[PDB]
Nucleic acid binder design. Structure first.
Ligand SMILES: [Zn+2]
Length: 252
DNA sequence: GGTAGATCCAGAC
DNA sequence: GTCTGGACTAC
């Protein structure tokens, strides 16, 4: 899931778990547990705590308990569901939080790329994976000025810059490619090569593109198909090590 | 200290 | 078999 989908999860999941008390934590792929490194300590500390809130930072979910926070990233394919402890688990279920009311919060992930970190609440924001996270793309803290400052410093492509979590929180490939198309900028352009006008426009399209989604594609996944604005075949190449889509006529 | 390269996984070719 | 992707290690 990308940022908009994660925000939907935050909103919809919260009322399904708030006020429930954890009675057990079961782990079927320990590699997902990143802190404490020992999955047994992860499970033990959570027991007895009640879910009090659920926040989002970038693509991270932050579950707020009594003393601790659970920081969760779904990567490409992770998903949460709430269901009865009486029913069989769905395939690829790797972590389960069991509540005292006989319901469960289940984490599934076919690829097993997702991560979980638990810390005392007061520490979570100053430890990985939240430490160094850049500003929310929809916040005044992410400004053209901030983007400009980062762009001028680096030798990397503009795509690489936007994918950088320290620059802006949780802005993924689909939105990078779409935002760059909408801003008329080739993804392979050196970030430092962007003019003030291009930075301003890119910021505007980033906020618009992801803002629209949080509340229909031009290039992403459209290789070999006509651009919706000029009819030129959309191309796909590798940029910043990732599959990257663009129109060679609309973007410069 | 900034950056490329490496990494994890299993489904799609 | 090869390719793919979000967010330490070593040049
Ligand atoms: Zn075009």
């Amino acid at each position: 899931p990308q940022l908009p989908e994660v925000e939907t999860i935050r909103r919809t999941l919260l009322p399904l778990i708030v006020g429930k008390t954890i009675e057990d934590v079961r782990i079927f792929w320990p590699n997902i547990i990143r802190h404490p490194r020992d999955s047994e300590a992860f499970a033990a500390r959570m027991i007895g705590q009640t879910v009090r809130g659920l926040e989002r930072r970038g693509k991270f979910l932050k579950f707020l308990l009594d003393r601790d926070a659970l920081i969760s990233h779904l990567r490409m394919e992770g998903r949460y569901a709430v269901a009865s402890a009486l029913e069989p688990l769905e395939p690829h279920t790797h972590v389960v939080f069991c509540f005292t009311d006989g319901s469960e919060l289940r984490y599934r992930d076919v690829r097993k790329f997702g991560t979980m970190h638990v810390y005392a609440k007061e520490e979570a924001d100053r430890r990985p994976p939240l430490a160094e996270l850049g500003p929310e793309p929809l916040s005044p803290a992410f400004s053209p000025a901030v983007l400009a400052e980062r762009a001028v410093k680096t030798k990397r492509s503009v795509k690489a810059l936007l994918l950088d979590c320290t620059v802006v929180a949780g802005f993924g490939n689909i939105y990078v490619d779409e935002s760059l198309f909408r801003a008329g900028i080739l993804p392979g352009r050196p970030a430092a090569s962007l003019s003030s006008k291009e930075i301003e426009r890119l910021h505007e399209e980033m906020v618009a593109t992801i803002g629209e989604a949080v509340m229909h594609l031009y290039v992403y996944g459209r290789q070999g198909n006509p651009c919706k604005r000029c009819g030129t075949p959309i191309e796909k190449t590798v940029v910043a090590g990732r599959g990257t889509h663009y129109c060679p006529r609309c973007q410069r």
